[PDB]
Amino acid sequence: IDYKTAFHLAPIGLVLSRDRVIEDCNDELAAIFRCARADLIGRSFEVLYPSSDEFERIGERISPVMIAHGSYADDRIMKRAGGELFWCHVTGRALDRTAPLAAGVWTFEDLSA
């Protein structure tokens, strides 16, 4: 199993992000959000939140923690395509902690499942 196959086979949603936009993701991510990978490539994380306000609020919660610690994890309500709300465990590591919401690796796991 090479790194590409690992990324795509992974049992959790994985994202390579830059500036809160999904640059690459796996099928597990697509599945959690009830869409296709193609729906998510080049898409702002905003669309996965219950609202734009939530996307803003949680971004402001992420930044200081990521800067201070170099990693981030939380649980939050997120929104599937079609509107269904669900609890989701999310973890993140920024490429540079002082640029917390820039390039990074992000994980998503459905907690209702």
* Residue 21 within binding range of its own copies, rule CB under 8 A: no
* Residue 83 within binding range of its own copies, rule CB under 8 A: no
Q: Which does 109 bind (CB under 5 to 8 A by kind): Na ion, its own copies, none?
A: its own copies
Q: Which of 86, 85, 84, 88 is nearest to 73 (CA)?
A: 88
* Residue 16 within binding range of its own copies, rule CB under 8 A: yes
* Residue 97 within binding range of its own copies, rule CB under 8 A: no
Contact with Na ion (CB under 5 A) among 17, 28, 30, 49: 17
Hey, which residues between 19 and 38 contact Na ion (CB under 5 A)?
20
Q: Using CB under 8 A, count the residues that bind its own copies.
A: 34
